[model samples]
Target: ASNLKIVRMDRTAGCVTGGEEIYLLCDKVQKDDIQIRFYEEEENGGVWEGFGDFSPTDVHRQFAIVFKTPKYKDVNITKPASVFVQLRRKSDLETSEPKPFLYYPE
Candidate 1:
């Protein structure tokens, strides 16, 4: 639900060789069901352009989502790009929210 968040971009780990291993931190996870989506923000602020999907990795109480870079090499996605994460509820996919809180380390 609202517990899911974007966490970070992890620039060093992704898009170097046209790929990346994104790390995410999820807290207060209600269930084991979740999915993350990566997006490239448009320069004109038109829409949150969809890049691709990524599966998450479980690390103790959190998760590390390792996603591959976008195939569109010509796309202009600047540093600190706007990444979107979509965490779904296993019971009801439609009940999940598109965006949630911004996970920050304490």
Candidate 2:
């Protein structure tokens, strides 16, 4: 099995208040059977709390995936929190290194 790699995230940091969309550039990512999860901190990496399993636009296939940020309420509404965005493969249950994503109430 090839390891999933994320080359870039259009917006490294942004407020989740508006559901901003982020374009992820990746390699070895499967076209189907994928999901993204949001964690409050890197330490809580595998804890599945805030977000849910979501698919990317198949048009880009393995090269790119566009997904929107979840609402602040879904994450945290008290204050700004640092979030770790991780990509997971549904087939083998493999996951990529957690990526940093800043979330604020603005």
Candidate 3:
């Protein structure tokens, strides 16, 4: 099983309202079988769950993509919430490995 990875992102911090366009540099990943997920978990029943808003066309290559950020489930998130971004594959459950990021209130 080949692991998926995020090499780097344009910025590691974002606003709570999200919807920001961000660039990601990643290891080679499948176009149809991949996704970007950011979750803020206190447990499984966490505060926020976010997914990237991008098309397959946004993936100009197998190693990078530019996508708009997703919003949180809550509007008034008080803290500069620390979250992890996961590059997951629909093809396998084990291909998910998360990257660190921060979400500040703006």
Candidate 4:
């Protein structure tokens, strides 16, 4: 399981949002299986919410998943919350040791 990239969009000031289609100009991941887990801060990495499936074009490279920010009374709102995505083997949680997915914007 290599050549995988995970990206989360908190602020889409430009045109491409997390839901938007973006091209990954890289080699597709070659693994026995791939999965991404989305989580909110409320659970402190305790509860992970499944959004979408692994696709060629998704939030995570070669994994297609979508989780829209919650709406509020139909009013245009901004979600100040943060989200986390993890890409790993299908049985990583059960078989292999899991590692933290860390990223530094700066």
Top candidate on TM-score is 3
The local distance difference test score of model 3 is: 0.80
* lDDT score at residue 48, model 1, on the 0-100 scale: 51
Task: State the lDDT of candidate 2 residue by residue for 1-106, as single tens digits.
Answer: 2377667788767675636777887766776777666666436454433453246553176777777777644444567667777777778878788788777766
Q: What's the lDDT for all of these models?
A: 0.42, 0.66, 0.80, 0.35
- Model 2 has a clash total of 0
Over 42-87, each residue of candidate 3 has an lDDT whose tens digit, in order, gives 6857556688888888876888989887875565778887888888
Q: How much does each candidate deviate from the true structure in C-alpha RMSD? A: 7.3, 3.5, 2.0, 8.1
Model 3: CA > 4 A from native = 44-47
TM-score each candidate: 0.41, 0.73, 0.86, 0.37
What does candidate 4's lDDT look like per residue over 1-106, in tens digits?
Answer: 3344443333232121223222222234433455544443455546534322334344344443443422212123243334444444465442122223222221
What residue pairs are clashing in model 4? 55-63, 55-64
Supply candidate 4's per-residue lDDT for 46. Answer: 63
- Tell me the spans in candidate 2 whose CA falls farther than 4 Å from its real position: 41-48, 52-59, 73-79
Q: Please report how far candidate 3 places residue 34 from its true position, in Å.
A: 0.8
Q: Candidate 3 versus the native: TM-score?
A: 0.86
CA displacement after TM-score superposition, residue 81 of candidate 4 (Å): 2.1
Better candidate number, 1 or 3, judged by lDDT: 3
